[PDB]
């Protein structure tokens, strides 16, 4: 949904 970082 609303990610802080790219490695999700």
């Amino acid at each position: 949904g609303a990610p802080t970082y790219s490695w999700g």
């Epitope: 990610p3 802080t4 790219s6 490695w7 999700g8």
Partner: antibody
Framework: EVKLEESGGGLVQPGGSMKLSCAAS????????MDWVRQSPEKGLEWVAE??????????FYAESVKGRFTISRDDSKSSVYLQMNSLRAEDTGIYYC????????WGQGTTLTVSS | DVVMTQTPLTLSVTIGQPASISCKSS???????????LNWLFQRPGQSPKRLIY???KLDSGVPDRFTGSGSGTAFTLKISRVEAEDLGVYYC?????????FGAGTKLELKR
């Protein structure tokens, strides 16, 4: 509502050990990465450690300053994430936050660690 | 790894007037999949940081509309259209493109007299 509540802070001597615990609720805990961040006047906000979800076999990652001294773990059944901290130093002093920064952002109230003789 | 530089370290603001703060990254925050993982956190004294902005310009749930994020590559800006009393505190930019997650040293919004 996403809730993170940390405990296990306190005063410890250099060389000493402390375990931080974080009880999470309000999201599917199994599926989230969990991240610890700390805050001190002198270093500001610093990422400390990450533990990944069951899919990534709970893969653990550490800041260079903390590698070999800290261990991040998780109990999927209790929705809890932990940070075992060994060989503590003065520079580890600060406020430790349990955070969800996986597909969203949520920060706990934090727990204070003081490393002093 | 990625160094985040915030200018001004302190901004003096009048309630009712706009604010603008800058964030610069030591390398591009553009990711392979086209996304740019720049976040803005806000911290009140004695309180935990709280994310306002993600993916450069997207507002978190319940964040007032006076907050706007912009930028690309290595240069980013947070703007407040009209400062309110609740907005006083420290703003941090946070880079989520390159492992480890890395933070600016913060910008303190202080009251002009």
């Amino acid at each position: 509502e996403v809730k993170l509540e940390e405990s296990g802070g306190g005063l410890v001597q250099p060389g000493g050990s402390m375990k931080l615990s974080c009880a999470a609720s309000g999201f599917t805990f199994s599926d989230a990465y969990m991240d610890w961040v700390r805050q001190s006047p002198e270093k500001g906000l610093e990422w400390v450690a990450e533990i990944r979800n069951k899919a990534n076999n709970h893969a653990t990652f550490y800041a260079e300053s903390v590698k070999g001294r800290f261990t991040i773990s998780r109990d999927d059944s209790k929705s809890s994430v932990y940070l075992q901290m060994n060989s503590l130093r003065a520079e580890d002093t600060g406020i430790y936050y349990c955070t969800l920064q996986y597909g969203t952002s949520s920060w706990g109230q934090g727990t204070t660690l003081t490393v002093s003789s | 790894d990625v160094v985040m530089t915030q200018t001004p370290l302190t901004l003096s603001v009048t309630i009712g007037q706009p604010a603008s703060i800058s964030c610069k990254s030591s390398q591009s925050l553009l990711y392979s999949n086209g996304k740019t993982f720049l976040n803005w956190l806000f911290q009140r004294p004695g309180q935990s940081p709280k994310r306002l902005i993600y993916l450069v310009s997207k507002l978190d749930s319940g964040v007032p509309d006076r907050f706007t994020g912009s930028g690309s590559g290595t240069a980013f800006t947070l703007k407040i259209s009209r400062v309110e009393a609740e907005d006083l505190g420290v703003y941090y930019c946070v880079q989520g493109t390159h492992f480890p997650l890395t933070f600016g040293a913060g910008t303190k919004l202080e009251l002009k007299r």
